Amino acid sequence: RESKTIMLRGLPTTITESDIREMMESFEGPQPADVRLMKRKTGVSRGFAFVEFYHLQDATSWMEANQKKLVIQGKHIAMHYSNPRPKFEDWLCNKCCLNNFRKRLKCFRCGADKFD
Ligand SMILES: [Zn+2]
């Protein structure tokens, strides 16, 4: 599927949330609605981030304009579409498309992780 939210996987753990957002600027395409680096309970990066866009085509054009040019520290970064993952709100599973309660960490149907 295609969506407004974009999942960047395999990011170097040494990379901070400010390093990403500054790099998000000066990129081609519509500037995103938000840039979300997922961190640990200690605060260290979990290695993946969420880049949300306002409309659908702003995400596809950004996916189209950067699915070859997103290299950081020499390592290519995987780029996948993802259902919206906003703070506090409900989330649709990416593996079985079921809508889950917001406080649910694992999926109700297939048990897939919220960020899997
Ligand atoms: Zn599921």
Residue numbers in the entry: 4 to 119
Text lifted from the article:
The RNA-binding motif protein RBM5 belongs to a family of multi-domain RNA binding proteins that regulate alternative splicing of genes important for apoptosis and cell proliferation and have been implicated in cancer. RBM5 comprises multiple domains, including an arginine/serine rich (RS) region, two RNA recognition motif (RRM) domains (RRM1 and RRM2), two zinc finger domains (ZnF1 and ZnF2), an OCRE domain (OCtamer REpeat)32 and a glycine-rich domain (G-patch) at the C-terminus. Notably, both of the RBM5 RRM domains are non-canonical as they lack the consensus aromatic residue in RNP2, which might impact their RNA recognition. To study how RBM5 recognizes cis-regulatory RNA motifs, we investigated the roles of the three RNA binding domains (RRM1-ZnF1-RRM2), which are connected by linkers L0 (7 residues, between RRM1 and ZnF1) and L1 (20 residues, between ZnF1 and RRM2).
We crystallized the RRM1-ZnF1 construct and solved the structure to an overall resolution of 2.4 Å using Zn2+-SAD phasing. The structure shows that the two domains interact via a hydrophobic interface involving the β-sheet of the RRM and the very C-terminal part of the construct. NMR and SAXS data show that the domain arrangement seen in the crystal structure represents the solution conformation, thus excluding crystallization artifacts. The crystal structure of the unbound RRM1-ZnF1 tandem domains shows an unexpected conformation where the two domains are coupled together. While this structure might not represent the “true” or average conformation of the tandem domains in the context of the three domains, NMR -relaxation data on the linker-extended and three-domains constructs nevertheless suggest a certain degree of coupling between the two domains in solution. While RBM5 harbors a phenylalanine at position 209 that stacks on the hydrophobic core of RRM1 stabilizing the inter-domain interface, RBM10 contains a glutamic acid. However, this arrangement of the tandem domains is not maintained in the three-domain construct. Nevertheless, the RRM1 and ZnF1 domains are coupled together in solution in the longer constructs, as seen by comparable tumbling correlations times derived from 15N R1 and R1ρ experiments. Taken together, these data are indicative of a strong coupling of the RRM1 and ZnF1 domains.
